[PDB]
């Protein structure tokens, strides 16, 4: 239904209120993702060494999560902004998977991430039907390349 | 003179013949960057631990440089494809600088990189005047954010 440009446009528009940067608000845009993630998906804290028992307040006051918040937020901005360019998008997916090899994640989490992230964006404001659908379309492609890459890399996959 | 979109368009067009991917040609697109880099800038090999004395043939036959070739090539595709979005672009610059802290690079190299890279693109084909100018404009902005970020981070800078 939607072409790549429209998906990119919708995903980019949905992030205008969650922009990366160096000011207090930008740091909050990233930190709040982890507060949402740790509150609503506490079973996934296990992957974050030393932070397995962190509460939202622990995350709020953690420089580790200020910095990591910016990294994941940046990653999602990159996905949104390069989606139109399918080969670059797929390159970035593979590189993300490579960089997560160390965490030994259940590979079914690659799709689940997009539920966390859209839920977060409902964790601060309006995410209209089209924008959520765009993220789920992007997520579907992210996951398809992730599982292909995992299989090609002799790693566990779904 | 050029707006951000035109710079992005020119930088993206210049990379169509150097696309990331998983086929032999795509791996070559990345490996060849390091063969060019190591041949023409041998004084910079010092940063690559274990590869300080590598020749082009050593790079050609190195899985390390096949993989690293894809990483730098991907990075330059990301710069080109997100340039229009200034805040995302600057976020990616800062993250690149952060990830290079370990190498203790002379900070004047951030600008120099763009000479290596445009020289490489003259290392396989036509880079017209507009496209080279676009890379130098992008490089100027990359460097400006790099030095600002280094200074803000209490790190050596120019
Ligand atoms: C539910 C799925 C995921 C889990 C459980 C997960 C887990 C992790 C963990 C544990 C870290 C290290 C953070 C720390 O210890 O402070 C990390 C880093 C990171 N993750 Fe994820 N991750 C997931 C999905 C993703 C996705 C989909 C992306 C890209 C859109 C991503 C991008 C990053 C980035 C950019 C970093 C910083 C280190 C790096 O550059 O690789 N993650 N992740
Ligand atoms: C002349 C300037 C630069 C030097 C000397 C340099 C040096 C290095 C070195 C030594 C490594 C580790 C590779 C290995 O040991 O196999 C590396 C990794 C990497 N570099 Fe650079 N670098 C430079 C500029 C850049 C720029 C401008 C970018 C982005 C456009 C970049 C992106 C990357 C990426 C993506 C990696 C892979 C690791 C990571 O994700 O951080 N580099 N670089």
Numbering used by the authors:
A (entry chain A), B (entry chain A): 2 to 159
Please share excerpts from the published article on this structure.
Ferrous GLB-1 binds O2 with a high affinity and is pentacoordinated in the absence of exogenous heme ligands. The tertiary structure of GLB-1* conforms to the three-over-three α-helical sandwich of the classical globin fold, where the seven/eight helices building up the globin fold are conventionally labelled, A, B..., H, according to their sequential order (topological sites are numbered sequentially within each helix;). Taken together, the observed functional data suggest for GLB-1 a putative role in vivo related to O2 binding, NO scavenging or O2 storage.
The structure of GLB-1* (bearing the Cys(127)GH2 → Ser mutation to avoid protein aggregates during crystallization) was solved by MAD methods based on the anomalous signal of the heme iron atom. Diffraction data were collected at three wavelengths at the ID29 ESRF beamline (Grenoble, France), for the tetragonal P43212 form (one GLB-1* molecule per asymmetric unit). Refinement of the crystal structure (at 1.5 Å resolution) converged at a general Rfactor value of 16.3% (Rfree of 20.1%), with ideal stereochemical parameters. The final model contains 1,305 protein atoms (residues 2-159), 1 heme, 1 dioxygen molecule and 202 ordered solvent atoms (2 of them in alternate sites). In the high resolution tetragonal crystal form the crystallographic two-fold axis gives rise to a GLB-1* homodimer, whose 945 Å2 association interface is mostly built by residues belonging to the E- and F helices (residues 72-83, and 87-101 respectively), and to the AB (residues 20-25) and EF (residues 84-86) corners of both chains. Stabilization of the heme group within the GLB-1* fold occurs through 95 van der Waals contacts (≤ 4.0 Å); moreover, salt links are present between residue Arg(65)E3 and heme A-propionate, and between residue Arg(100)F7 and heme D-propionate. The HisF8 staggered orientation is defined by a strong hydrogen bond (2.83 Å) of His(101)F8 ND1 atom to the carbonyl O atom of residue Thr(97)F4. Tyr(35)B10 and Gln(69)E7 are the only polar residues in the heme distal site, which is essentially lined by aromatic residues (Phe(34)B7, Phe(38)B11, Phe(49)C6, Phe(66)E4, Ile(73)E11, and Phe(114)G8).
